[PDB]
RNA sequence: UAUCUGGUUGAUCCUGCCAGUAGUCAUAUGCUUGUCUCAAAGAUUAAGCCAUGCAUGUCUAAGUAUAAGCAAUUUAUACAGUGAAACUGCGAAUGGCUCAUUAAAUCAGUUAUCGUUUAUUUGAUAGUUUACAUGGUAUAACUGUGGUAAUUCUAGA
RNA sequence: AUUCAUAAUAACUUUUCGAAUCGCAUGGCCUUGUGCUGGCGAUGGUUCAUUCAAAUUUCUGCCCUAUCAACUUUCGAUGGUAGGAUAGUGGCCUACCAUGGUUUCAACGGGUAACGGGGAAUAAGGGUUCGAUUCCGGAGAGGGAGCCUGAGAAACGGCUACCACAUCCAAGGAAGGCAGCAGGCGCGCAAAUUACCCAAUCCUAAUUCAGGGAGGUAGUGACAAUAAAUAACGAUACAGUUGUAAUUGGAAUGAGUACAAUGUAAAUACCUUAACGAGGAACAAUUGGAGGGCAAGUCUGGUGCCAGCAGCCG
RNA sequence: GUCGACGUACUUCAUAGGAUCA
């Protein structure tokens, strides 16, 4: 190619989107924005596909357009805005609020809050840094820059942003005994607790996650993200918790249910 | 007699309707107009007819019944503003706008595409050379 | 371009069609049961294949293995349910023990004809084809038609057909008009 | 032969034809070969204007 | 190959041999072709040549309208609605097609940029240098005068 | 892990940036002035980070060939120093230096009906073959070469030259690139429509609105696949409890036709359904193979009347 | 030139043996 590409086949689409291989040829390209193209859930697979709102992309479109939806409390008009992990969807006329979880099965579910929950989110530090005239600023899991943090935030560690001011409200430190979420892969969506980080020089450090089932499993560390202290999340946490559970446990208890 | 059911209603303030499924029993017809369904749903949902849309009709195998999907708008300022085009075309809300064929608008354009700047100069200057 | 959509075959040509006694299994087969062609019995013999293979495979797994647990018990559920294995004889083993016959039994054709809708299997074919025939509420004109166990109770004539409650066909008020003429 | 081309006309307006079909047809007269025939190309005939 | 058929002599058995019978896929071709669902369309190693048409344009309340444009008017004597043309900005580097070259080249998995560019999106970020606001160092559309057989040619004022 | 982030000092610059822009609304102070102050947005702008990307890059992995054993190095081949150039590392190029680098663990040269992979087929397993072809990546736009613009192109539905073709011409000049969608030629022998639409999928723009042969819809050689009609129930008759019916009774139904409705952007079709639609059910199922029998008939041969060939023809 | 050698593709000849019976 000659530049940047402008179209993204449905086969070629993020699996955990769950769309359609016959409704069409082409699926949304996420536009460039806070969260990586594969890691985020365009704002019109959220509202077409997930809450069925809309029935087609110009219902999206006309949504949108009426500025209904705010992400991390700032109203959006882009029908392909990245929304991704962590991000607050709130929808005033209908009186919800969202946050954008994995599921146990690695798929963004619907999650509803209550709106003291949707006043914040939280974000991995990707960075610290010092900016042009010694100003010391983090740099989070979806792009955001804050300037003046607390000289103990360090890398991995999880900040809890204040979406009204986006403002450093409380710090979480990476160490054993901490509670995690899997944002990465095939163990993804996933919750546990730390038990060892394995540091390799020059490599990727491993950590080693056991569940509230006594299961343990083995990330790289940059799909780790730290949401609290063990049995005290930061945040409401979805259905089933993050357990996995095994194909025969699944059938016993939909057979159950049903 | 005919019995029209609203399954997985769906109340959707952003768009300003309520969206669900219409199953519709028809013992001894063929099927119901949707004229006939939008005048029920707007009696049931106490609405303006003009403010039900309906489509996406399909008779099941063996008739007897049929399964489609519906909406309902607030008020009928909405159902316009909302609405598709061609769907208000099929109620008689909204007139057929007539258009030239996609051939004859496009080498229209090109046509135009050639000439540059109004083009009455190049006619006067047309018509004093011949 | 669009995704593909996926076909398969849902029936083969046997290793060796001209054995003399295949060839009189085959007319056998096809005379009790009203087939049309020889491809209807391939079709059932290549599902059987497949399931008896399937059976095979789980079976030469280790006991308690939970992919033998979880795939023979759904393979035993299923057959079970459209009724070609009893209920007493849940296991593999009777599963290599199934028989082209046990299907052919389960296909609505064979079903009319037995609940005494029908005089002859070739009778309940026809009155399948010519919409006669509902399973529950819904009219089916299927004779491959594979009949559970829930619905084996629910076969009856069909409440549009001239036999089920509905008016006289073409013919009958044909001929009562041109009487009444 | 197998795979002729075979022309549509629909209807007769002024005594004429649709003018797309024609153009059809006019263009596939224009390109069209002709094979040589062994009567044809060993007698000479006319036909009278 | 297997199975089955037939021949091996004056005849019948038992061996052996011999001949024909297996296969889907691919190419070309022949005959037939009623209904429902569904789906593809290469090939002369000729990436050989193409008549004709179309396939890339785009304006919101929010850059520039005294169109001698339209319609509304005294909501508007600076403008104010809609708006051709042109300037300005963006896109045209995406998409679609073909497999010619290419044998550590491409490509697959896996690494690095402490070795560099990055429109756009997202978050931060600029009290330090006539102003009740400067020029043509200027033109387009437009008016008007023209050349050419001819082109999405254009010259002077 | 750094000469890193950042900061400080001395200067330097055809040297930048630090809003002379636009929409909606008319709030608060008073010394009552078209005075002071002030809201929600749009578009630009430096730098950092992020996102979409790009470029280069580390390790391992390619079919046939040894009757291809030495190759590279004069004209960069391997490396060092400095410079130039690039967005940047680098023989990428230049100047000066050394003589290096690859190879029987197959270099180099040659062949390839060689784009690579995910994949396809077969097979009991090992294997063998196929992969232009729905996704990913690469390369090309008749063949070489070189560029403007721009963040991004060595672009070709952009430009300039040359090579080959080729259109218009008043002969002075001008205009070209279907390996895009339709449709032609390449033979004298052949095969989809020069169709409708942006309604869905998504993409572009100043942007909900315009555009999109991308894409969808329908049409068109049985590509490859799924299901499945062409009759069912009786009586009578005839013939050697079996077979045969241009025999016969009244019941069933869709192929097709068609009000209508549904479907669709509009249509066609499907699913529904009034009214028509069956005895030769002529509403006329096909493709191959095997075996007969008949004459005042025809041909050939001969241990009589026979045998072979064969028989649309007497 | 019905030429030699080689390469390639084909054709062909070598199948009956034992036991019983007449
Ligand atoms: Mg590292
Ligand atoms: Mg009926
Ligand atoms: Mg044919
Ligand atoms: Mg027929
Ligand atoms: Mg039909
Ligand atoms: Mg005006
Ligand atoms: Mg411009
Ligand atoms: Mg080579
Ligand atoms: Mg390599
Ligand atoms: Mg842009
Ligand atoms: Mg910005
Ligand atoms: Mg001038
Ligand atoms: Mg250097
Ligand atoms: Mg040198
Ligand atoms: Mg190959
Ligand atoms: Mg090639
Ligand atoms: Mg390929
Ligand atoms: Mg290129
Ligand atoms: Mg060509
Ligand atoms: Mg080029
Ligand atoms: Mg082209
Ligand atoms: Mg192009
Ligand atoms: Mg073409
Ligand atoms: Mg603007």
Redesign the interface.
């Given at each position: 190619a000659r530049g940047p590409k402008k179209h993204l086949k449905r086969l070629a689409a993020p699996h955990h989107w769950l769309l359609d291989k016959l409704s069409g040829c082409y699926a949304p390209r996420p536009s460039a924005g806070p969260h990586k193209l594969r890691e985020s859930l365009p704002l019109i697979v959220f509202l077409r596909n997930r809450l069925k709102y809309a029935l087609n992309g110009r219902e999206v479109k006309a949504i949108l357009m009426q500025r209904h939806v705010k992400v991390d409390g700032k109203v959006r008009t882009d029908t392909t805005y990245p929304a991704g992990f962590m991000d607050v969807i709130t929808l005033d006329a209908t009186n919800e609020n969202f946050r954008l979880v994995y599921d146990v099965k690695g798929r963004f579910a619907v999650h509803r809050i209550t709106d003291e929950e949707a006043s914040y989110k939280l974000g991995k530090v990707k960075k610290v840094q010092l900016g042009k005239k010694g100003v010391p600023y983090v740099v989070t899991h979806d792009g955001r820059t804050i300037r003046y943090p607390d000289p103990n935030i360090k890398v991995n560690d999880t900040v809890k942003i204040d979406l009204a001011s986006g403002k450093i409200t409380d710090f979480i430190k990476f160490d054993a005994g901490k509670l995690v979420y899997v944002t990465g892969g095939r163990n993804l969506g996933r919750i546990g607790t730390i038990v060892h980080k394995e540091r390799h020089d020059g490599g990727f450090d491993l950590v080693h996650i056991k569940d509230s089932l006594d299961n343990t499993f083995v990330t790289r560390l940059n799909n780790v993200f730290v949401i609290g202290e063990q049995g005290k999340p930061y945040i409401s946490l979805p259905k089933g918790k993050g357990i996995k559970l095994s194909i025969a446990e699944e059938r016993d208890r939909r057979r159950a249910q049903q | 007699a005919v019995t029209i059911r609203t399954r997985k209603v769906?109340s959707?303030?952003?768009?300003a309707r309520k969206?669900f499924v219409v199953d519709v029993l028809h013992?001894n017809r063929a099927n119901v107009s949707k004229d006939e369904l939008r005048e029920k749903l707007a009696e049931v949902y106490k609405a303006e007819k003009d403010a039900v849309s309906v489509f996406g009709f399909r008779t099941?195998?063996?008739?007897?019944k049929s399964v489609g999907?519906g909406l309902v708008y607030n008020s009928v300022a909405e159902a316009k503003k909302?609405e598709?085009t061609y769907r208000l075309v099929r109620y008689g809300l909204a007139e057929k706008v007539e258009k030239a064929s996609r051939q004859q608008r496009k080498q229209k354009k090109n046509r135009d595409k050639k000439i540059f700047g109004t083009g009455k100069r190049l006619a006067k200057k047309v018509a004093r050379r011949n | 371009p669009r995704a593909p959509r996926t076909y398969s075959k849902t029936y083969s040509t046997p290793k060796r069609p001209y054995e003399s006694s295949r060839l009189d299994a085959e007319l056998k087969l096809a005379g009790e049961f009203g087939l049309k062609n020889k491809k209807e019995i391939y079709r059932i013999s290549f599902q059987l294949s497949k399931i008896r293979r399937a059976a095979r495979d789980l079976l030469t797994r280790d006991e308690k293995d939970p992919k033998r647990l979880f795939e023979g018990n759904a393979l035993i559920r299923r057959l079970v349910r459209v009724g070609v294995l009893s209920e007493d004889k849940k296991k593999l083993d009777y599963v290599l023990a199934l028989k082209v016959e046990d299907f052919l039994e389960r296909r609505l054709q064979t079903q009319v004809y037995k609940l005494g809708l029908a005089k002859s299997v070739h009778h309940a074919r026809v009155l399948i084809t010519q919409r006669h025939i509902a399973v529950g509420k819904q009219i089916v004109n299927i004779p491959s038609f594979m009949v559970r166990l829930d619905s084996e109770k629910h076969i009856d004539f069909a409440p549009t057909s001239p036999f089920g409650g509905a008016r006289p066909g073409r013919v009958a008020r044909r001929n009562a008009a041109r009487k009444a003429e | 032969y197998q795979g002729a081309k075979l022309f549509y006309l629909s209807g007769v307006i002024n005594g004429r034809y649709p003018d797309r079909e024609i153009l059809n047809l006019s263009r596939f007269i224009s390109v069209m070969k002709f094979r040589p025939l062994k009567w044809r190309n060993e007698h000479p005939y006319m036909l009278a204007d």
């Open positions: - | 769906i959707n303030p952003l768009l969206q013992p099941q195998f063996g008739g007897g999907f909302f598709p | - | -």
